[PDB]
Every structure is written in structure tokens, then in C-alpha cells.
Amino acid sequence: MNEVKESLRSIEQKYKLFQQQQFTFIAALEHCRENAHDKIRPISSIEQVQSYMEHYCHRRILIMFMDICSELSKLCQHFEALHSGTPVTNSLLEKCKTLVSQSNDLSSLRAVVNHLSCDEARNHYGGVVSLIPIVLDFMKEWIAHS
Amino acid sequence: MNEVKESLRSIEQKYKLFQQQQFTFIAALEHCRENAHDKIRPISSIEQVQSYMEHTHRRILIMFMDICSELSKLCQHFEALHSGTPVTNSLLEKCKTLVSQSNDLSSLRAVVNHLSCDEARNHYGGVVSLIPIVLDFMKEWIAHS
Amino acid sequence: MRECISIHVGQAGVQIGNACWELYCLEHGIQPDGQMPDDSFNTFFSETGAGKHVPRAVFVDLEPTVIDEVRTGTYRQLFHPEQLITGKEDAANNYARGHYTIGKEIIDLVLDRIRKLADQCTGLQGFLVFHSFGGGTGSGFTSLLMERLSVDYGKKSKLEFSIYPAPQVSTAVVEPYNSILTTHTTLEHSDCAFMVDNEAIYDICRRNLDIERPTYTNLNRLIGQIVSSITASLRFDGALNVDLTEFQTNLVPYPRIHFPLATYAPVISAEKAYHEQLSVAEITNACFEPANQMVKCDPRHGKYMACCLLYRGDVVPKDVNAAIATIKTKRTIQFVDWCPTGFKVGINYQPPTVVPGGDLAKVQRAVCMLSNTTAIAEAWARLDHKFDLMYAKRAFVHWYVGEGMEEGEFSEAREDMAALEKDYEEVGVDSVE
Amino acid sequence: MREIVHLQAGQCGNQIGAKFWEVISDEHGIDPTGTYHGDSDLQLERINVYYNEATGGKYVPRAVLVDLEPGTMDSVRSGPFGQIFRPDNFVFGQSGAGNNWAKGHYTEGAELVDSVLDVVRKEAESCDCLQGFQLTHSLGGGTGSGMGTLLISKIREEYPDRIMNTFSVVPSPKVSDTVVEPYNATLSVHQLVENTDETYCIDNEALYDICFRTLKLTTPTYGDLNHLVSATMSGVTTCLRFPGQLNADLRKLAVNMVPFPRLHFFMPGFAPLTSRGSQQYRALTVPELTQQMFDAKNMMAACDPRHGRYLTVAAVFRGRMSMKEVDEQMLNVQNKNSSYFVEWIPNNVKTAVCDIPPRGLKMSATFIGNSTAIQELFKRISEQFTAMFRRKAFLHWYTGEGMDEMEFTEAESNMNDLVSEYQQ
Amino acid sequence: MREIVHLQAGQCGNQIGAKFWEVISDEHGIDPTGTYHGDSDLQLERINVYYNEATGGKYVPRAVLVDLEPGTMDSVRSGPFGQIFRPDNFVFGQSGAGNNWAKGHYTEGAELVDSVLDVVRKEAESCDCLQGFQLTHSLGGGTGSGMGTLLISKIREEYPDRIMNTFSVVPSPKVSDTVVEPYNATLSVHQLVENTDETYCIDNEALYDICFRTLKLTTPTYGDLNHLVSATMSGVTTCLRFPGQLNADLRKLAVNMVPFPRLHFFMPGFAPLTSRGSQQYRALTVPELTQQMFDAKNMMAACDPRHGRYLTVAAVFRGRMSMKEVDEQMLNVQNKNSSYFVEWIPNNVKTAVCDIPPRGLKMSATFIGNSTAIQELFKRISEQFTAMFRRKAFLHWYTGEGMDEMEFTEAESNMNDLVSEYQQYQD
């Protein structure tokens, strides 16, 4: 229990530093979409952000997003190892695991969104910017139930 | 599991390079059929493509044969990974049948849109459809496994 | 219908108007992303078919770092994403450069968005320009905008909220210049421009409000609950309503004398309210002490020439007119003699809303006493003296005359304010026959 | 968004500018590689004012290093951050000027002017919206006083709009490390005053003084003595790259501060300066700033503010903070020292606040203060110049170029005029 | 489908073209055995343009080697990609050039020219639809201009209306490596200007300098100094065989850059030139690629382009981009360098693009420029000629070979006329 709270607080501190650079993250994604010729579709997955970073990239802020998603995914594994859980904690953990899955569709996900234009929030980045804060809330709720 | 995914990705990369040369593959087959005096029948098997190749065009025919050989080896690697389920075993048997040297491809249709209606119906629609269909069944097999 | 547009120009506009929309969106059931989980909102909202409302706003300035955190805040999603107008290079507290060199590259697209917003909704009646006299982009850039909206839109009313430099608290040194260079344009092309300083907001946050160490967040919030109260009956029902077109015919005696104050008198801390009830007869007595007047001038040296009493909440109209007649008997509040009627009230059915996480207390009563006075006569004449001793040897003129504009406009200021100071003594005298 | 271009010229100006790019980068997070490995997102969104983006996710500073000898720069390659510079920026000569204003402005400056101004144009017009030109030099030796005077003679003509921010490490009052440095200094200011926009003045004796009295260090090294002047010049720019409640540009601090066109020489300062023992004995709030910043122990020039009157005072605060303390304290210091300030200026002091402090520090400040106490510096420099000039001593080189006798009487004539107008 | 014809004569032009066929093979993916091993099929649709198809899957070139010495030819069979070349092209004699134009052209020039032109005629009718000429000559050599201006002059009573490209390594009048070279030089321009169409002026002096600074090499040798002109001309002959977004041909170029009959002279160029030390620090994008091409120290002149305005400019891009990048980045350079483009062209630059990058890069380009600055090269060769000539030196040799002192009089007389027109329109 103490270790997973310390891990969550460490991820929250990294996420605060990432959130201060949200405009640089959006500019990084837009330049990668330009180089990919992929301006038509929303950014729908963590895997798409990774593909942009590897082939079309800004790289530092994309790495910071990927590192936070990796640490959230590892923290889900640590929650599973702590206890067999309850219907509530298991439902929260499964939501976290689904959201931090590489290929999960984020296109409809909305929490960070208020810093986007209505077009960017609806059609481009509203999903991906909403991922981390929503997963952090479910992990806090999971701890509070556990 | 990781090894067979890496093998499949390697075959997909070779197939992408082959697909860019599809017109050269068709021209290679047509010239071989002319030399064989075999313009009447569809190209119906991998063995017929091999016979044409043996008896730039040669390079693209070798690339087709190499991809079919690697797909056949990848079927053997799938069989060795687990005893499977009715679904994975049905997918694997379809792959093994399609990459068998003498299997009839004449009716096989996925690459077909780059052919004229005559070429797609009567000549090459089978052989050009082989690789992409087998790759789909192998992806589906991995996704079930 | 009953509508107006809000223009936030300058940093003293876009920061003050940053804090007004959170109350405004929490004035109603609109969750602040843009949607709503009742035709009141449409005065300051242009509703779309999707359910999203659009705030009536435009944000024009020459600095990029002040508009950008709104574009990265939580109100990038409530707002339509390209009236957040943003320049590149700065006027930076120079009057001649936000008006004649750098602001002129962005003007023609501002008025385009003005025409775009005005021609969607039919019943325009006023404008809410948020600015100040304290900088360059809030002062000189606006001094062209107030003469665009007047000659081109005819006789539409237009209202401003501009802060005023205090005699002791002023951040910039050139602030004696760009105030008096702004006022050559104000009297001829406006109807009202209310006054406040920054110092007297702090004292009410110390004395009547308990919470010490005031940032700009709590200081903005006090003007946020005042411009809500001017527009309180446009969007809501009332026992006695006030619109906005009549404010220009009964608060304004003379063709130059249109500079009144405001007094949100029930301002009270959460525990200070628990040891003193807020009944209406002691509500209206909180307007008239010199401690709660929002400008640092003494009301006991001047004559009032009008008043207004905008109430809200659980106000029966029987306590108000009884409490009207008691203040007439007093001698410490004196009126000029060519206004025997004096007064004006408005009552409404809605309680004022305190901001959650905020520093006021929940009530069911309020007063916003907007009135004019003779007391601003001395506040004008002191800043003519600060203008004089800097122009006595032409101190900061090399950031102005080098921008291609004559010294002679500094001479027209002394033609302006001296000819606009004798009026407070000419027609501010006794009854002469 | 509004980029300013940074130069270092001459070994005095090169060395103090050599330290900037390690401190400014750790105010943003750029590693010794050149990559970004920060923690927060706000420390990239205005990165382009000192940077050019490059492929691969690497940034690069915009230092245009210029000298006349190859000895100075080969240490700068070998320094800690010598691998994050664009190698075409290092431009240098082969034959030494050697502490001469004649060589730095006429002899060896007439040849390598064009191979450097082309690199000036190659960085200037290729970036979007320029805002300034930070040049680090002094009046001490012959290169950095002679080559920087020749360099800015064109920068104000092909680029006559932008703000020229020249810097100066003015010679020490007691002695300095040259024997002809009055000639190196009074020739520099002959063309500085009419042509630049605003100049900083740095004193090198007061570099040493404020590390022993206030920081109590036993080993004052030039690696540490430039770390303090890097903290001030990175402060005037802390609102271009960070937000705040009331933010300050460079010109916004120039149009307010400068009263008259020809009087643009400043005096830096810096509030949190705590000894290694006194760390645990000092509180961090605003009354520990206005006393520690406004005192003569913290100013950086050979002036006597008790003998003079401040024209204007600037004070850029930093850290998220509550600013009635900034208002009401600097009301009081205005109202206490009524004879320390001039009287025809009604209100004197300009406040500015940031929101992100120096790394690991709770809060800080930065002082830039105009004074009418620096005329005796220009009196004593132009007095000891006239001690050397009266017997025509050390005219062995300047006569040899063919420069007339009329050249060196004009710099003394116009340094009578400036010191007659600080009295004004 | 538009096949094209390559020849060479001289020392350098017989070896620069021996660096061409290495470059085009790697663009196409051709092994030293003649077997094709390229990756993409988008090139194989147009493999016929330069290479002749050969039976069995091999592919064969069509260039013609002709010179009077065996040695420089025998270097090519010693070369890396000199093994795919066709064996009956190698027509080699026995005699010595002596760096003499008198023996490359008039004395010995009657014999082997009739024996090599009919092998061109044995390849001209063989192709489907012919396009043009690549004769690769040193200007003013013994086998350089002795066989250069002769060979294409006798063509023109067969092909009057056909395009022609030549890679003329210009003498660069600062210093020269032959004492008789201005005598060899001014007779080339005597017979070309009424006949020649597009010459590529190649300075070795400029390419000694740009391999020194904008490449920063340590030992630039002729095995790589020929490369930077070898890869330049492949961009011109790429839009013939590769699809693009606004594609181009060589006759599309000739309408664009020959306003008067006399003014048709070119400066080549290649866009992404950056040293190995500062590649990772740099980002390869369009608004910085455009700055390399238009640097005045980048194009291959031994002259400054400040005095010389530009008639008409062409630039062939490669790789995938957008075009209002290029359409604006055209329009910008007229606005600021308005005294560097003449007023009497409405659209001063032809802009052409393509779709496929070179190997090892994501995108590239190629600069092709035409000036009013080359007349300082054209005056000074005559200036180092007329200093050698007014003293009546070296006349009895050419008189013994047939060439009088009468012939040398019209050369400066016509270059009085030709070099006037770069100067006349400076107002």
C-alpha cells in the first residue's frame, strides 16, 4: 500500500511537469501528423503517439507522455498484485488497464481539454490529453477503496 | 510467440516490396506463358509459377517463391507453438492448404484491382491473391493464439 | 434581444474579464466546458444547435503571453477558438505605439469580428469594453476602438469599466501621460466610463473582508460581482426592472459629466456575517460611508447629483422606500439642489451567487449603488499636476515625438482638462438669479 | 516568439558570456548533449527566443562567437557545454590584435568584419520576429572595446529598428590588469553613447567584494564570479520565457526606465545572496529583499548613491507570490528615501513579477537601477586618461596607423559633455 | 520512351562521365554484373530511358567513348562500374593530343570522326523516340575541345530541332593548368554560340572551395571532386523518368531559359550539402533547403553574383513536399533581391518538383541558374588570350596545321559582340 501511493505521487509529479508543457505536446503531435500526412483522423491511441515519435518526429515531450503511460501501466500490475480485490476495485483496475493499453481507442475520451480549441478538442487531441488525468483519478479512487 | 510475430512482420515487409513490383510480376508470368505456349489456362498453383521460372523477371518470380516458402515455414512454426483450438487449427489448415505447392488457386480472390477484368478472372487473380489472404489468416491465427 | 458584446482589451481588461465569466457560467447551470445539463443566457451567449453556448467575447492585445494561458487554461473549450486575438510585438506602455505603429496591423480584423458578432443577434443595446487608463495597449489602442464603434454603428450605447491611477499607488512612471492622452477621445465618443482605483479594493479586503494578503484573483472578483449587478435584470425577472438604454438618460446630467462610481455594499466575510444580520435598512447604510466607496475620494467634500440602488434577492419593496426616506433627513449626505427627486431603485427576484471556494458569504440581499458626485473634481486635478511637472521639462517625450507625432497633442491635454475642470465649478455653484 | 540574438566578443566579453548558456539552459532543462530532459511543460513553450530548432529533437543556442585570436575559443570548445554549439558559429582570426583599439577597429577589424556580419545576417533574417541583440564585451582590453565598437556601427544601420543591448565590465577604481586601459575605455565610449540603445555597467572589484562580505567563500574563482552576473542578465529576460501576473519585456523595461536619449547606463543587482553559515538564519519573504537589494553592498558599480539621486529603479520579482507586499513596501522605500530620488519624477519604481523561480530556490529578485552617481566614474576615467595624454605617452601605436591628433581630443571633449549632463 | 544520348571527349569529361554511371546505377539499383536489384517498382516503368534493355535480365548502357589515347579509357575498365559498358563503343586511336586544338579538330579530325558518328547513327534510330545529347567535354583541351565543337557541329544537318546538353568544365580565369589553353579556349566559343544550346559551366576552383567549407573535407581528390557535378545533372534528367507533381522535360527547360538566341549559359547546384559534423544538429525541411540553394557561395561560379542579375532560374525538387511552400518561397526571393532579378521577366523562376528522393535522404533538389555575371569569365579568357595573341605568338604552328592568323581575328571580334549583351541590359 505505501509503495503504490509513493509510485502514484511520483507519476502525479511527472504529470504536473508534463501538463505545464501541454502546448509543446500539441505542437509536437501536429508536426508529426504533418510529416505523416495524417491530419484527417484524431489521435486515437498511445501506439499512434509512439509511431509518430519513432518515424515522424518535440521528441522529449512525446517521450515524457510515453514514460507516464508506461508507469501507469506498471502501477496497474502493482495494484493487481496487492489483493484479489472487490467488484469495485476490480472494475476500477480494469478501466485503468483498458485506458493504458497501447491500442485502446481514446478518440471519445474527455477529461486539459479547455486549453484546446473546439476543433482540436473534438477532432484531434481531446482523447490523448484526457488519458493521464482520468487514469490518475481511477487510481486514486482504487487506492481509496483498497 | 514473439519469434513468430517477428517472422510474420519480416514476411509482410518482403510482401510490401513484392506488391510494389506487381506489374513486373504479371509481365514475368505473361512472358513465361508465351514461352511455354500456355496462354489458355489460369495460373493455378505455386508449382506452375516455379515451373515457369525454371524452364529481372526471374528475380520477381524468385521473390514470390521465397515469400511462399517463408509462409509455409511459418505454418510449421505455428504447429510447434501449441496443440491449438478448433479455431486456430482451422486457420492453420487453411494456411497450409493455400501454401501447398499443388493447391488450386484458380478461384482464389483477395492486388486484384490492379488487373484488367480478363487478367483477374482468367489468368492471375488466383496467384496475386495468395500472399495477402495467407497473411490475414496468419494475423488472425496469432490474434486467437 | 436585450444583448451586449464584451470586448476585453489590454491586460487590465483581459485579466479582469478572465474572472467575470466563471461567475457568469456559474450564474446558470452551464457546466464550464460549454454545455448545459430558461431563455436567460442568450443576452451574453450565442447558442449553437449542438447545445454548446458561445461566450460573447473578444480578447485583443499586443502581448502573446497574457492571452495564451487562457488558450491553455480550462476555458479554451468554452470559447470559440479564434476570437482569442494575439499579436507578436509589444507596444509596452507607449501611447503612440499601440495606436499608430503596431496596433494598426490588427485593427481591421477586430472590427470584422465585431461586425460578425453584431450581425448574428438582433437586439444589441450596448457594449462592455474592459480596459484601463494604466498602460499602452489598454489605453491608446482602445482610443481608436471607441471612435470606430461610434461613427460606424450610429447611436448605440456603449459602456466602459476603466480603473484610475491612485495618488499614492501607481506601478508605471509614465501613467500620468497615457491616462490624459486617452481622455481626449473618451468624452466625445462614449456614454459612460466607470471609475475605480486599485488601492481602495485592498482596504475593503482588509476591513470588511477578513481574508488578508490579497492577490489579483480576489481583487478581480469584486468587479465581477458589480458588472453582474448592472446586467442583473436583463437576464432575470424583476419586481422593478432596469434595462440598459435608460441608464444614459437619467444618470447623466450634462454632455460631459458621465463618470460615476459603484458600491457593492453587502461585502462581508463568512464568520463576520454570523455575528451581524444583513437586514435591508442596514444594507443601504453600507453604501454611504467613505470606507466603502471604490475610489479614493472623500464624499463629504462634494455634492451628489444623482444615485441608483440596484437590489437583488429577498427585498420586499416596503423596506426600501422606508429606508429611502430616512437618508433624506441626514446632513452628512448632502445633495445638489437641482435634483429634488435624487434617487432611483431596482428590485429583483434572484439571490446573488457567491463564488464557490470564495471569500464572500451566502446571503439573499445585495445593493449595487452606482452614483455620480462632485468628489471626482479633485481626483482629476491632481493628475493634471503630475502631468505638468513631467511636461515642465519634457521628460519622456522621446518615446512619443520620435514615433512621428507632434508635441502639440500634449498641449491639447491642457486645453482638455482645464476646460473640463471649470465645469465642476461653473455649474457646480449655488442657485443664482 | 520574439527572438533576441546573443553574441560574445573579446576575451572579457567571451568568458562572461561563456557561462550564460549553462545557467540559462538549466533554467530550461537542456542537458550537456543538447536534448531536452526537463520536468515541466512550461519550460519549452517560449524556447525559441534563445534557440534554433534542429532535426531529431535537438535545440541549439544562437551564440555567434567572434574574436581575433584562436587562443580564447579553444578552451570554450573544451568547456562543459562546448559540444552544444553550432561549429560554423566559431569565427576567429590568426594574428593578434593584442590589447589595441587601433587593431580591433581599424587594422584587423577591417578584414574580418565581412566574414562575421554574413553570419549575423545568416541568423537574423532567417528567424521570424526579432527583438534584440545581446552583446557581451567591456572596455578593458583592446579587442572587446575595439571590435565591438566597429561591429555595432553596422548593426544599427542595416538593422536600425532593433534594441541594442551592449554590456560593459568597466575598469576597477583602484587598479586593473592593463596599463593602457584608459585609452581602451575612452575610445569605446566615443561611439557607444550616440549609437547603442541601453548599456549595462559591471564592476569587477565588486564581483570580489560581494562573495567575501555576503557569501563568505574562501575560494573566489572566475568560474564562480561569472555565475553571479549570469543570474542578473538572465533575469531581465525571465518574463519572455515564463508568464506572470505583471510581465516585463526588454524594451518595456527600457521605455520606462530611460529618461533621456543619451543617458542609458545601468547598474545590476540581485536580492537572495546568503552566506553558507547564514543559510539557516534567514527568512524568505519580501522584507528580506527590499533591504538587501537597495543597499550599497549589493550594487555593482563604483558609485556613491548617498552622493547622488536615483533617476529610475526596476525590480523584477520571481516565484508565485502575493504582491501587496511588493506594492506597499516599494511605496515605503519611495517615501522614506525622499532625498535619494529625484523630484521632477513623481513616481519612480516599476514592479514586475514572474511565476517560476530559479531551480530549487523558493523566490528571487533582480535589480536594474539608474543613478546619477556614476558621473565620477566618467570623471575619474577621463581624468586618468588626461594624465597619460598630457605627455603624449603610449601614442606609439595610434600615431603609427596615421590617426591624427584631432581624433583623441574628441573623446575627451565629449566625455566632458556627458559628465556635464549627469549634473543636469 | 524519350531515350537520350551520352558522349564524352577530353580527359576530365571522360572521367566525370565515368562517375555518372555509378550514380544512376545506385538510383536504379544495378549490380556490377548488370543485374537489376532495385527496391521499388516505380522506377522499372522508366528503365528504358537511359539504359538499353538487354536479353536475359541484364541491362546495358548506351554511352559512346571516343578519344585519341588508350590510357584514360583503360582507367574505366579498371573502374568499379566500368564492367557493364558496351565493348564496341570503345573507339581508340594511337596519336597524341598534345593539348592541341589544331590536332583534335583540323589535322587528325577528319579520320576517326567519320568512324564514330555512324555508331551514334547505329544507336539514334534504334531507340523509340529520341530526346537529346550529353557531350561531356573539357573546354579548351586537346581531346577536350578538339573533338567537342567539331562533333556536334556536323550533327546539325541531320537533327536541326533537337535538344542538347553539355558539361563544359570552364577554364576559370584565375589560373590554368595549360599554357596553350586560351588558344584552345576561344576557338570553342567561336563555333558554339551560333550552335550550342545549354552548356553547364563547371568550375574546379569553385568546387575546390565548396568541398573545403560547406562540406569541410580533409583530402578532396578527383575520385570525389567529380561526384558533386556527377550527382547534380541526375536531378535534371529525373523528371523525364520519374513522376512528379508538376513534372518537367528538357524542352520545358529550354523555352524557359533561352530568351535571346545568344544567352543560354548555366550554373549548376545541389541542395542538401551539409558536413558530417553538423548533420544531426540540423533539420531537413523545405524553408532551410531553400536557403542553401540561393546562397551566393553555393552555386559553382568563379564570380560574384552581385554584379550579375539573373535572367531566368530553374530548380528541380525531389521528394514529397507541399507546393505553396515553394510557390511562396519563389515569391519571397523576388521581393527582397529585387535588384538581383531583371525587371524584364514576369515570373523569374521556373519551379519543378518530383516525388522520389535520392538514396540516403528524405528529399532533395537541384539548382540550375542563368545570370548576367558570366561575362566576366567570358571577358577574361579573351583577356588572357589577347595578351598571348597581340604579340603574335604560336602562329606558325597552326599555319603549318592550316589555321591562319586570319581566324583568330574574328574570335575576339565575335566575343566583342557576345559579351556586350550581358552588359547592355544592365539598365
From Swiss-Prot, chain A:
<dbReference type="GO" id="GO:0008017">
    <property type="term" value="F:microtubule binding"/>
</dbReference>
<dbReference type="GO" id="GO:0005634">
    <property type="term" value="C:nucleus"/>
</dbReference>
<comment type="subunit">
    <text>Microtubule inner protein component of sperm flagellar doublet microtubules. Interacts with CABP1 and CALR. Interacts with INCA1. Interacts with microtubules.</text>
</comment>
<dbReference type="GO" id="GO:0036064">
    <property type="term" value="C:ciliary basal body"/>
</dbReference>
<dbReference type="GO" id="GO:0005881">
    <property type="term" value="C:cytoplasmic microtubule"/>
</dbReference>
<dbReference type="GO" id="GO:0030317">
    <property type="term" value="P:flagellated sperm motility"/>
</dbReference>
<dbReference type="GO" id="GO:0097546">
    <property type="term" value="C:ciliary base"/>
</dbReference>
<keyword id="KW-0282">Flagellum</keyword>
<comment type="function">
    <text>Microtubule inner protein (MIP) part of the dynein-decorated doublet microtubules (DMTs) of multiciliated respiratory cells and the distal singlet microtubules of monoflagellated spermatozoa. Forms an extensive interaction network cross-linking the lumen of axonemal doublet microtubules.</text>
</comment>
<keyword id="KW-0539">Nucleus</keyword>
<keyword id="KW-0966">Cell projection</keyword>
<dbReference type="GO" id="GO:0048306">
    <property type="term" value="F:calcium-dependent protein binding"/>
</dbReference>
From Swiss-Prot, chain B:
<dbReference type="GO" id="GO:0001669">
    <property type="term" value="C:acrosomal vesicle"/>
</dbReference>
<dbReference type="GO" id="GO:0030317">
    <property type="term" value="P:flagellated sperm motility"/>
</dbReference>
<keyword id="KW-0963">Cytoplasm</keyword>
<keyword id="KW-0968">Cytoplasmic vesicle</keyword>
<dbReference type="InterPro" id="IPR027818">
    <property type="entry name" value="SPACA9"/>
</dbReference>
<comment type="function">
    <text>Microtubule inner protein (MIP) part of the dynein-decorated doublet microtubules (DMTs) of multiciliated respiratory cells and the distal singlet microtubules of monoflagellated spermatozoa. Forms an extensive interaction network cross-linking the lumen of axonemal doublet microtubules.</text>
</comment>
<dbReference type="GO" id="GO:0008017">
    <property type="term" value="F:microtubule binding"/>
</dbReference>
<dbReference type="Pfam" id="PF15120">
    <property type="entry name" value="SPACA9"/>
</dbReference>
<dbReference type="GO" id="GO:0035082">
    <property type="term" value="P:axoneme assembly"/>
</dbReference>
<dbReference type="GO" id="GO:0160110">
    <property type="term" value="C:axonemal microtubule doublet inner sheath"/>
</dbReference>
<dbReference type="GO" id="GO:0005634">
    <property type="term" value="C:nucleus"/>
</dbReference>
<protein>
    <recommendedName>
        <fullName>Sperm acrosome-associated protein 9</fullName>
    </recommendedName>
</protein>
From Swiss-Prot, chain C:
<keyword id="KW-0969">Cilium</keyword>
<feature type="binding site">
    <location>
        <position position="137"/>
    </location>
    <ligand>
        <name>GTP</name>
    </ligand>
</feature>
<dbReference type="GO" id="GO:0021766">
    <property type="term" value="P:hippocampus development"/>
</dbReference>
<dbReference type="Pfam" id="PF00091">
    <property type="entry name" value="Tubulin"/>
</dbReference>
<dbReference type="InterPro" id="IPR000217">
    <property type="entry name" value="Tubulin"/>
</dbReference>
<dbReference type="GO" id="GO:0009612">
    <property type="term" value="P:response to mechanical stimulus"/>
</dbReference>
<feature type="binding site">
    <location>
        <position position="198"/>
    </location>
    <ligand>
        <name>GTP</name>
    </ligand>
</feature>
<dbReference type="InterPro" id="IPR036525">
    <property type="entry name" value="Tubulin/FtsZ_GTPase_sf"/>
</dbReference>
<feature type="binding site">
    <location>
        <position position="11"/>
    </location>
    <ligand>
        <name>GTP</name>
    </ligand>
</feature>
<dbReference type="GO" id="GO:0008344">
    <property type="term" value="P:adult locomotory behavior"/>
</dbReference>
<dbReference type="GO" id="GO:0007613">
    <property type="term" value="P:memory"/>
</dbReference>
<dbReference type="GO" id="GO:0050808">
    <property type="term" value="P:synapse organization"/>
</dbReference>
Curated annotation (Swiss-Prot), chain E:
<feature type="binding site">
    <location>
        <position position="143"/>
    </location>
    <ligand>
        <name>GTP</name>
    </ligand>
</feature>
<feature type="binding site">
    <location>
        <position position="144"/>
    </location>
    <ligand>
        <name>GTP</name>
    </ligand>
</feature>
<feature type="binding site">
    <location>
        <position position="142"/>
    </location>
    <ligand>
        <name>GTP</name>
    </ligand>
</feature>
<feature type="binding site">
    <location>
        <position position="226"/>
    </location>
    <ligand>
        <name>GTP</name>
    </ligand>
</feature>
<dbReference type="GO" id="GO:0045171">
    <property type="term" value="C:intercellular bridge"/>
</dbReference>
<keyword id="KW-0206">Cytoskeleton</keyword>
<protein>
    <recommendedName>
        <fullName>Tubulin beta-4B chain</fullName>
    </recommendedName>
</protein>
<dbReference type="InterPro" id="IPR002453">
    <property type="entry name" value="Beta_tubulin"/>
</dbReference>
<feature type="binding site">
    <location>
        <position position="11"/>
    </location>
    <ligand>
        <name>GTP</name>
    </ligand>
</feature>
<dbReference type="InterPro" id="IPR017975">
    <property type="entry name" value="Tubulin_CS"/>
</dbReference>
<dbReference type="GO" id="GO:0005879">
    <property type="term" value="C:axonemal microtubule"/>
</dbReference>
<dbReference type="GO" id="GO:0003725">
    <property type="term" value="F:double-stranded RNA binding"/>
</dbReference>
